[PDB]
Amino acid sequence: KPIIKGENLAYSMDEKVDLMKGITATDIEDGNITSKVQIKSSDFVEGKSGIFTVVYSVTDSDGLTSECSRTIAVTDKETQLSDLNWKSATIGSGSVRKDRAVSGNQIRLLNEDNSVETFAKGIGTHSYSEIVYNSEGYDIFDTWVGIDRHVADKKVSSVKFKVYVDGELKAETDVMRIDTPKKRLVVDVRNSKEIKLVVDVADNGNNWDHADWADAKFRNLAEYDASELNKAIEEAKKLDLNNYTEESSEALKNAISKGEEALLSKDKETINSALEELNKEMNSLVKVDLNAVINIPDKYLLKSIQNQLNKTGDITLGDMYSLTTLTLSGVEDLTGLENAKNLETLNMDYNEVKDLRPLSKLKKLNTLNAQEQFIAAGELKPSNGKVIGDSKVYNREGKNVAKTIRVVDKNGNTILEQDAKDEFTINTKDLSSGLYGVHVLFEDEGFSGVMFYLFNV
Numbered sequence: 001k002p003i004i005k006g007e008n009l010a011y012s013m014d015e016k017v018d019l020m021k022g023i024t025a026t027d028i029e030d031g032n033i034t035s036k037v038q039i040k041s042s043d044f045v046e047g048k049s050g051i052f053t054v055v056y057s058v059t060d061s062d063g064l065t066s067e068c069s070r071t072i073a074v075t076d077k078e079t080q081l082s083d084l085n086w087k088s089a090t091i092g093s094g095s096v097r098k099d100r101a102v103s104g105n106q107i108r109l110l111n112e113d114n115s116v117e118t119f120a121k122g123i124g125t126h127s128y129s130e131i132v133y134n135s136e137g138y139d140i141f142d143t144w145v146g147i148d149r150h151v152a153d154k155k156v157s158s159v160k161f162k163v164y165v166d167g168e169l170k171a172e173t174d175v176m177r178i179d180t181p182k183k184r185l186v187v188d189v190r191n192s193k194e195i196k197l198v199v200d201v202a203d204n205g206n207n208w209d210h211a212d213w214a215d216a217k218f219r220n221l222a223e224y225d226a227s228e229l230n231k232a233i234e235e236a237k238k239l240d241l242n243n244y245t246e247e248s249s250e251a252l253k254n255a256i257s258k259g260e261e262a263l264l265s266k267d268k269e270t271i272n273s274a275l276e277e278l279n280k281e282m283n284s285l286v287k288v289d290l291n292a293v294i295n296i297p298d299k300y301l302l303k304s305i306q307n308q309l310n311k312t313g314d315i316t317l318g319d320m321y322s323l324t325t326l327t328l329s330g331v332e333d334l335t336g337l338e339n340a341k342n343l344e345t346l347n348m349d350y351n352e353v354k355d356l357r358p359l360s361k362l363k364k365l366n367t368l369n370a371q372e373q374f375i376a377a378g379e380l381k382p383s384n385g386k387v388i389g390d391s392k393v394y395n396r397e398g399k400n401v402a403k404t405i406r407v408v409d410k411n412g413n414t415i416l417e418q419d420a421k422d423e424f425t426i427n428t429k430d431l432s433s434g435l436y437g438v439h440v441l442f443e444d445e446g447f448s449g450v451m452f453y454l455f456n457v
Ligand SMILES: CC(=O)N[C@@H]1[C@@H](O)[C@H](O)[C@@H](CO)O[C@H]1O
Pocket: 093, 094, 095, 102, 103, 126, 206, 207, 208, 209, 210
C-alpha cells in the first residue's frame, strides 16, 4: 500500500541527470522508504537528447508493491515565452507583463528554503488568466509558478496553475498561497498547436492573486549529438602510441585534442568534422619498426653508441630509443642521433662537432655538454686573389653561434681579427708567402670551440 511519487523533469545538455531526483516513497506502516525505491525500467541513455521515460517500483515490509512513471527531458535550445507574442491573453486585474510581475516589480517567487528567488524572465499575470501561445515546433514547456512576492503581506492570495495543450489538461498545481514554495511544471508539447496557461482563482476570488510563470520557456531537443565523437576519443586513447611512428602518433594526439575541443562547440558540423578527422588519423597510424637499421656515417659516433649499448654491428631504431645517456669520443658528425628520441644527457665535450642540428628535435635533451670542440675544417684554396670560407657553426636552433674570426701567420701573430658572420673573405694578394691559420671561435649555452682552416700563400 506504499505511495510512490515523481514528476516530470528537464535538464540541459550540460547537466548530469539524476534518475532519482524528486522521487519519494512513503508507507503508513513502513514510514519513509525513498531509499528503497528502484528503477523498474527506462529508455534513458546518457549523452543523448530526448524525452526519456523511467518507471520506479517500491516494495514495503509486507511485500506490497507500488509503481510510478515520469519523464526526464534532456534538451538544448530554449525559447522564453516572454520573447514571443501570445495569440491571446486575459487577466483579472492589471495587464499581463513580459519579464515583470503584474505590479511592474521584478518577478519574485518563494524558494523551498524560504529565501526569495528574483527572476530576469517570465510572465507576470493575475487570476483569472488564460494566455495562449503558438506551440508549434517545440518539444517541452518548462516553468516555475507561484504567488508573486509583491503581495507577501496580503494574506489572502491563492491560485491554481494549469497547463492545457491543444485544449487538454496536461499539468497543474494544487492551490498555491503566499507561503507555498515555487513549483515546477514540465510538459510535453511535441506536435502541438497551442499551449494555454491558466491561473485560476482558488479561494477569496481573485483578490491579490498576483501570479508568475517564472522562466516560462520552451526547450527543444538537441540538433547535434556528441556520442559518436566521445566514443572515438575513448577508442583513440586506448591505443599504445609506442606501437606507431612518432609522426603518425603525433597526428593522432592532435586529432584527439581537437576532438575534446569540438565537444565544447555543441555544434553538429564541428563535432562531425572532428570525428571524421579523428577516424582518419586512427586509420593513418603507421606501425613502428624498431628493428630498422639507422644510418650512422660517423664511425666514432657508431663506436660510441655501440659501447653505450654493449653491442657490435648495426644500430637499430629500437637501440636508439633505449639511449637516455650517451658519451661521445672522436665524433665530427651527429647524423643518426635524430633517432635518439629519449636522449636526456649527451656528454660530448672535446669532440669535433660544428653542427648540433641533428639534435634539434630531441625533446628530452636537458643536459648537453658540448664545450671545447676542435673542428679541423681543412684547406681553403685561393681563387681570384682571395680565400672565402664558411664560418657557420650551428646550435640546435640552427643559429650561427660563431663569434670571432682570427687569422694567424706562421709565427703565431694575429694579422686579422673580425666579428664572425656566415662567411669570411681574406685578401691573399698582400700576404707574405707561407701558411696561415683561420680560427673561428664560437660559444653558446653548453657549446663552444674552434673551427680551424689552413691556407697556403
Ligand atoms: C494589479 C493589482 O495590483 N491589482 C490589485 C488586485 O490584486 C487587488 O485584488 C485589488 C484590491 O482592490 O487591487 C488591485 O489594484
